[PDB]
Design a protein around this ligand. Structure first.
Ligand SMILES: CC(=O)O[C@@H]1[C@H](O)[C@@H](COP(=O)(O)OP(=O)(O)OC[C@H]2O[C@@H](n3cnc4c(N)ncnc43)[C@H](O)[C@@H]2O)O[C@@H]1O
Ligand SMILES: [Zn+2]
Lengths: 285, 10
């Protein structure tokens, strides 16, 4: 109906009246769809809705560590299509870079494995790749670490004969992407513990911190527990095509929900903040 | 929270 401009305007208004509190972002596949990477669960268009040809027990099994061990072919097949390299960051990714340049980015917790936040120039210290990435590989048995080249080389083979195996225990080796059944990197909870403490300090001191959740269905734990764990005194924002997770289950009075595409949201926010000059330096850098 | 990566319970 009406433009989302008025809603995004309130976010800008919040930042302007609460300038001394950096912003935390929690993102998912939605912020990379415009880059050509499909999300996972949107009806019809989500990746999990287009895997019938693999004839898996069910879509999510392609990222399940137990299934992978039983038959690694399905994952190797899909990995060929989602391996990083030919994708470029979106306007939303550059919004993260803009916040970093203005030094108002506290952290970006991402569930994406495309590493586009890093490619957009966001510093390693401000990024938490909660679901891992293709940066390196590891044995699902003993945990031995391997360079990414071992796996990448195999992906380029056709047909594949033998899959990468650990020379220490003999189990299969795969990219350090967190599969269902595996624990997330220690950095995830360690950093959230730190940022959560920081959020309390800010509210227990005043200016209210802001957490913006974008492009995720909050269907996977433990990442989905983040919005729930945000202190009540901290303002939550959800920019997503659908109201999801804790924003739908336990709507809080101060919650601000905006149904908009991530890039358009970013453009509107930059406009309302009046940071076009610095944003321009980034898009052309 | 922590624990193994999992699809939320329904
Ligand atoms: C890769 C992997 O290890 O695992 C994936 C991944 O990290 C994970 C979590 O899925 P994730 O939540 O991130 O994916 P989903 O595919 O579950 O959700 C994407 C969400 O983004 C919304 N969306 C899509 N395009 C958008 C856009 N341009 N602007 C705004 N919103 C948009 C969409 O409506 C949905 O709620 O589950 C998978 O199992
Ligand atoms: Zn091993």
């Amino acid at each position: 109906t009406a433009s989302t401009e008025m809603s995004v305007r309130k976010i800008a208004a919040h930042m302007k009246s609460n300038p001394n509190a950096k912003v935390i972002f929690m993102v998912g596949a939605g912020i990379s769809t415009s880059c050509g990477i499909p999300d996972f669960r949107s009806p019809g268009t989500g990746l999990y809705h287009n895997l019938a040809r693999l004839k898996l027990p069910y879509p999510e099994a392609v990222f399940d560590v137990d299934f992978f061990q039983s038959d690694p072919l399905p994952f190797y097949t899909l990995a060929k299509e989602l391996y990083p390299g030919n994708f470029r960051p979106s306007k939303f990714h550059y919004l993260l870079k803009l916040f970093q340049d203005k030094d108002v980015l506290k952290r970006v917790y991402t569930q994406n494995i495309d590493t586009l936040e890093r490619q957009a120039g966001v510093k390693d210290d401000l990024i938490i790749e909660a679901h891992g990435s293709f940066a390196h590989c590891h044995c699902i048995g003993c945990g031995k670490v391997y360079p990414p080249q071992v796996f990448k080389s195999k992906l380029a083979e056709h047909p594949i004969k033998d899959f990468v195996k650990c020379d220490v225990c003999g189990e299969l080796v795969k990219p350090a992407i967190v599969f269902f059944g595996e624990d997330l990197p220690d950095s995830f909870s360690e950093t959230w513990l730190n940022d959560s403490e920081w959020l309390r300090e800010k509210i227990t001191t005043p200016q209210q911190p802001l957490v913006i959740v974008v492009g995720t269905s909050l269907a996977v734990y433990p990442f989905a527990s983040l919005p729930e764990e945000i202190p009540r005194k901290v303002k939550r924002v959800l920019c997503n095509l659908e109201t999801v997770g804790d924003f739908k289950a336990n709507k809080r009075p101060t919650d601000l929900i905006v149904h908009q595409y991530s890039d358009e949201f970013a453009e509107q926010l930059v406009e309302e903040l009046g940071w076009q000059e610095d944003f321009e330096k980034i898009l052309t850098a | 929270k922590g624990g193994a990566k999992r699809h939320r319970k329904i």
